[PDB]
Amino acid sequence: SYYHHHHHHDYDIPPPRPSSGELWGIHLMPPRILVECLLPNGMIVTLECLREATLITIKHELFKEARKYPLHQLLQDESSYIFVSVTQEAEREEFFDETRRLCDLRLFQPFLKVIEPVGNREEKILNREIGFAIGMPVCEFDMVKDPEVQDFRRNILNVCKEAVDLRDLNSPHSRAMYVYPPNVESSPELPKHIYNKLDKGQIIVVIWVIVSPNNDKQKYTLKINHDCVPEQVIAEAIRKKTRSMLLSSEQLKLCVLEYQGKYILKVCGCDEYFLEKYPLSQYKYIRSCIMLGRMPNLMLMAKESLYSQLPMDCFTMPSYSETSTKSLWVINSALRIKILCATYVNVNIRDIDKIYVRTGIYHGGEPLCDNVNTQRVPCSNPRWNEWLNYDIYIPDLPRAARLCLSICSVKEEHCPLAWGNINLFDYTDTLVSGKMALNLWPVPHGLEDLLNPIGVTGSNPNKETPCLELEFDWFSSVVKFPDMSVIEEHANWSVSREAGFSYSHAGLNELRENDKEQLKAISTRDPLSEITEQEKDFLWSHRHYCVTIPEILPKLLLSVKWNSRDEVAQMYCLVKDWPPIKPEQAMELLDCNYPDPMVRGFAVRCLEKYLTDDKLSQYLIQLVQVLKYEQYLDNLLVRFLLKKALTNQRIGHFFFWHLKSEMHNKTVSQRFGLLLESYCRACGMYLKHLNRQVEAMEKLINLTDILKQEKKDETQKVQMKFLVEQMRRPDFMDALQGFLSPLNPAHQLGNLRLEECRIMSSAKRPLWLNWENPDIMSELLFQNNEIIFKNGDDLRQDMLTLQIIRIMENIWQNQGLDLRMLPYGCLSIGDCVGLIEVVRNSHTIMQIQCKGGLKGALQFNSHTLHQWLKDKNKGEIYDAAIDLFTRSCAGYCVATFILGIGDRHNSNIMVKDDGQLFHIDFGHFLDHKKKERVPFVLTQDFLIVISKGAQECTKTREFERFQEMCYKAYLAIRQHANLFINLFSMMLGSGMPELQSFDDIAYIRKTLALDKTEQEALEYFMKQMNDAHHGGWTTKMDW
Amino acid sequence: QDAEWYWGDISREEVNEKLRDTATFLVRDTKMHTLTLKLIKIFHRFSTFVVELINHYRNESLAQYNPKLDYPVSKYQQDEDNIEAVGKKLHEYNTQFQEKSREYDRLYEEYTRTSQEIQMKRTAIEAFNETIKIFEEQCQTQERYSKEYIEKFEKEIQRIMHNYDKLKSRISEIIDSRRRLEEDLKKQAAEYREIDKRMNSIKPDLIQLRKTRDQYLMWLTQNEW
């Protein structure tokens, strides 16, 4: 009847991560298990011990059962020896902490061996902390026999030494500074809208003290100028406290100094301090307190007590500590590469007729014609021993030159089967020669291309993969790149050489035309604007003029022909002393497009000279990812990042988490581990703090795993029964009660409150946790710390958008435009596992609708939101709440549209009690849907609120106000668009399916319509917004 | 003047996207402020010719203008008078990529799951091997201190020998475990190859359908499917 009565016979009824389990196979080891503990004697006494048992208690009772067994006399006094066994990472691990529980060892199998302690340096031996924290044994690194790796570890400690000395140089002030960096804004001058909130530079601040019953606390409320520093603020509080009828002004003044220097200001209820003289407004807490219309609560903190909390770092060095035969420009031959033989390639014989290897020389983008070796030996056992010849004189190879290749199978059956890339120079500036064995990577999901030159350079460390064997021409000597001294000569000679020609050709007369300032026009252009060869020569020819426009430096590298060694040599020289540029400008230079070290190095110096620790935190995600494209392990960017990491604990905290999150990624696994090794060795007592966080995350990761795959198809009631039962168990109390939330390590987490902990409704079983705040001023800030641990979704796409959102707010704020957007906290801590900050007193539009739902069977009254919102805010409040709501709504409209994030519906849009609106679960972010569109469409419901419950709300003063904000805000972002493109561009490494290529990033361009006039763009922006909304968006412009 | 390979006001990005998977000539053109091969701006007022220019370098080397300048590829694909029908046909062609993609991407996950599963097993063995080796050391460890006290053949030795044996019969059990793993990893490795096999088979089918489909879609003049 329905389906033309035609059956389908096919039809019938019928993410990954290394186990976080206590045992191999098993997620949760049983309460009682059978532990075969092996003794020096050769007796296998088998033991039953509690799953949560100390090694102490096992050794203590093993010895008891030991007497009752053969050869009791041979076994010595307990204290003499110790426990060791094979772990879930296949490594033998000696067990120095006897307090460690059995389930916390990640044993492969449930057995222990007793041996005496070997290596007198037990404390040295006990850097398993590093490996624990890092996620792989430091032992594994010593095995690595590559000279680059070995050199990295030995050489990189220069930084570590330097860093340590600065911390303890001015000990202890200096230590505390490192441990508790001041959290301050980029510039002191406050925005006028912020300025208006306070009265003629006046702020009311409450300072608290505890004094002599050391149990009771005392406010000293007071009104200070915002620019006042803490020293002055501490004084004001001391003046107020000690004023008395018996105290004369002279007497009082003298006490103030003696008690003045002795105290420091700390924020109440979280470990954030003010130890640097900046204007109070400049600290973040302060400026939050202003905006949120809240009164600051600082606390006078005895320096003596604060210094007592800091512990001695006691950094210790680790156990680990020619004749330049022919220069490159000497060599006189065309580049030759000998392809030998693929091995493991697997293709159905029938389907693909023939298979061949395709190679190209690259410098990011190509320096000569790609060539493919003749298609041959298709079916199997490919052994084409062809030498490929590339038209480029060997001297003309640029330092950062890389061979790119793949294997393809095939009338247009073109398709890559495998790919790989090789740096043409070793880390020692040496041109590579000889046989090379290269294990290819598998193609990514996204690319039909045959080459993948963005692919990380180096051999895939998966052995069981297609391996391609190669020969690199040998020139009777190891060939090294020329010294900087040598290149300069060539630069100068080629300069002197230019004067003598008479005629003019396509690319270079001396006279510098005023009309041709096109450069400036081009300069301003956004990076994704393709530049023409005609423009390329144009620029190249007036290279010397550009030194006046420092900002044009990046357009001016893409112009250069990198194949010509003359041009490049000259370019090295411009770049040498070129003028420092704005860090955001400089950041473009660390992306995949600019691989030259000289260029890179210059870029870092921009950062070194001009990058404020505040701004570095803002851009820290991007800067770690750009590490993938850096050519060797030892580079200046890493050293810049490592010093900043070791010189600022807050920067270091996030430095560690961002590296650690990517360790699952096998392309960067090696560079990031070694970088983590470095950092962990020298960071200080934080490592113990990081180890607690890592212990906790692993505990949660394993727990969630059990709900997601063993407790699925169970009632929530049964799951929560399990959840609560498991958390009460002692290793969980230990492992989660006392540690710093990774979302923000200022917030201290203690004594988990299980009352308030629960599994959320989502099928991924995100855990909703609530812990006690143990700051003595819990009350003045927040009493309970809540955060959502989610194992299943891939946060970093969300992660990035929240960074972009945060970044728009700053631009707008600093352009006087007060659009308030809540970029809520998010941290990716591994493979599709993360934390999400919880915002209280915030509900989804849907929830609003369900709360305010009448008898039924109708559309929920659009007014419900307004009605709900009216009922929370009554009185003079109501005007302000709409403002906030209205401001936020307009702000999100622009960003959402600009970024083209996921379609918004009632389910992914949140409104706070106060009136602020925020977005969550952005998901996919640049129209990956297609496989120009308004994601956020204001429905009736929003408009009513925007127009204060009007009828026919589209034509209201309120809405007019609203449209203004969008144009100004959208326009504001458009003017800064350069920054967003680089931010996106820098993330191309990170294995994110949205960012596979520059093409992907290109949607933003369309969205901001960088190809039209600003006035044109406003009309275009209005067009789409009118087009999507169905009306109200028309006929307006500038004064 | 249309010239068949002239796209009028096609966007910067889309040229790259129509020059997607090309081994080629195509033309584009701020009006106040352009052939792509390498983007070269043209000038009607770049370096004695507009339409004739394309024919001028259609069969002639551009080396004259610049050294780096030593396939029309804009076929409208006439290769069907009913807009809906050709549309239905292209949508039915489309109805395959939407399916083909799904099979491609289904395997891509299994590809990855299997590959992760493989390393897990791969490392597991290492785990055994080192465990295995310790139990050997243990059984060897006792003989030095076992026979060394053997002086009696009173009672004690007989009991200890039975306790010692478990060890040799445990080692037996473990080797059997690793073994049992190894035979699964083979079953995995072989599984793994097959996925790559079938991926390289869909891999380029998926390409041709997507192309003619886009060609059929591009062919008409006014995203239903």
Residue numbers in the entry:
A (entry chain A): -26 to -13, 2 to 308, 321 to 409, 416 to 513, 521 to 943, 950 to 1057
B (entry chain B): 329 to 351, 354 to 359, 362 to 365, 369 to 372, 379 to 386, 392 to 393, 397 to 398, 401 to 421, ...
What is written in the article reporting this PDB entry?
In this study, we highlight the capabilities of the AMX and FMX beamlines at NSLS-II by describing structure determination from single crystal vector data collection and two methods for multicrystal data collection. The advent of next generation synchrotron beamlines has necessitated the development of new strategies to fully benefit from the increased beam intensity and smaller beam sizes while minimizing radiation damage. The high dose rates, in conjunction with the newly developed ultrafast raster scanning goniometer brings formerly time-consuming serial crystallography measurements into the minutes range. These new opportunities mean that inhomogeneous large crystals can now deliver high quality data collected from their best volume, and crystals as small as 5 to 10 µm can deliver one or more complete datasets.
PI3Kα, one of the four classic Class I isoforms, is activated by growth factor binding to receptor tyrosine kinases, like the insulin receptor, producing the phospholipid, phosphatidylinositol-3,4,5-trisphosphate (PIP3). We have previously published a series of PI3Kα structures, including the holoenzyme, the complex with a lipid substrate analog, and soaked crystal complexes from a fragment-based drug design effort. These structures were determined from crystals grown to an average length of >100 µm, which required an average of 6–8 rounds of macroseeding. A 60 µm vector was defined along the length of the crystal and data collected in 0.2° slices, over a total rotation of 140°, at a flux of 2 × 1012 photons/s, total exposure time 28 s, with a volume distributed dose of 10 MGy (calculated using RADDOSE-3D). Completeness was 96.4% to 3.35 Å resolution. For example, for the PI3Kα crystal, vector collection along a 60 µm vector uses the full volume of the crystal to allow for the collection of better data.
